[PDB]
Amino acid sequence: EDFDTRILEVRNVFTMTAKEGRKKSIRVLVAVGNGKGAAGFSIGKATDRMDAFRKAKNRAVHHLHYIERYEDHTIFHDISLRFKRTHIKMKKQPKGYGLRCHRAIITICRLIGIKDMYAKVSGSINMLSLTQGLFRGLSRQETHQQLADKKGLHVVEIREECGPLPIVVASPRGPLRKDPEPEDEVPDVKLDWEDVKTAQGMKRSVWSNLKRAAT
């Protein structure tokens, strides 16, 4: 009773049979989630649409991921991934930002319990790949605690709204290293041109930052 189901896609797939010719089947993608991190998805197939809905709904609950939510409202860090030909680039956002993402990601996020996030889907906009990719990235996100333990260092959060106050969000449960992490003068990191282009005010889009209903 805690879990809620929401349809993502309904497709009329067809095969050819010797006796009848075109045989119509229903392929249904559904996502189930209780809103507290536990969410899954499944594909249900049946000649009747009701049977397809049921099969997908009941099978999705046996394939539940657990999503680590930072402060139970957003992701811990920005996740960029490619699943097959679909690119999903998700950004961590502050409280009150909303779900500025593809309608399907909005639906899945509400089931997971993420309230604030931005995501841009590029490449193929296949619904199967998007869902499978979204759950792949969110499942693999590293929490602040896991980072502190791996690095043996404090994770200190700097917030602009709190000035210079150092907020320690995670500390290493084991021994704390005494050597500071080597500060590379120039980071050899791969930058997304779309990010850099926006930061330099070089991106004019009439469709970006349009006023939309509360999500």
Partner: protein, 135 residues
């Protein structure tokens, strides 16, 4: 409920997370035992991939100093007439006896393998061992 995603994490990680979320009302019987005495490696599914290019296995061939003696002995005399009894853990073969005598004479301080090999054979011949050379 449970999670059948056997390729995402481990049974404990999945079970622990679902119990924390409240999906699993009661943790399974094995959960407490696993946590108390966990295995050395967490059982996470990983895909086997072919080694390409210069990648090689780290397994190294097991060799010993006496293998050089054993190889020479087997070439000179061949397999001993006595049949190897591998059931007996303390079984010594004619070749092993040669290695032992060879090593004992190495402690005496002979520095020439050929001379040392000849001396080793002579000591065995004196002890009554049958050493029929291939020739």
């Amino acid at each position: 409920a449970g999670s059948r995603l056997e390729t995402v994490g481990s049974i404990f990680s999945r079970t622990r997370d679902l119990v924390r979320a409240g999906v699993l009302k009661e943790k399974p019987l094995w959960f407490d035992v696993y946590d108390a005495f966990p295995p050395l490696r967490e059982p996470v599914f990983q895909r086997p991939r072919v080694r390409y290019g210069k990648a090689k296995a780290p397994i190294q061939d097991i060799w010993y100093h006496e293998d050089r003696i054993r190889a020479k002995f087997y070439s000179v005399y061949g397999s001993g007439q006595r049949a190897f009894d591998l059931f007996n853990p303390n079984f010594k073969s004619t070749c092993q006896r040669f290695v032992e005598k060879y090593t004992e004479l190495q402690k005496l301080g002979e520095t020439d393998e050929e001379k040392l090999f000849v001396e080793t054979g002579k000591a065995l011949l004196a002890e009554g061992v049958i050493l029929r050379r291939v020739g």
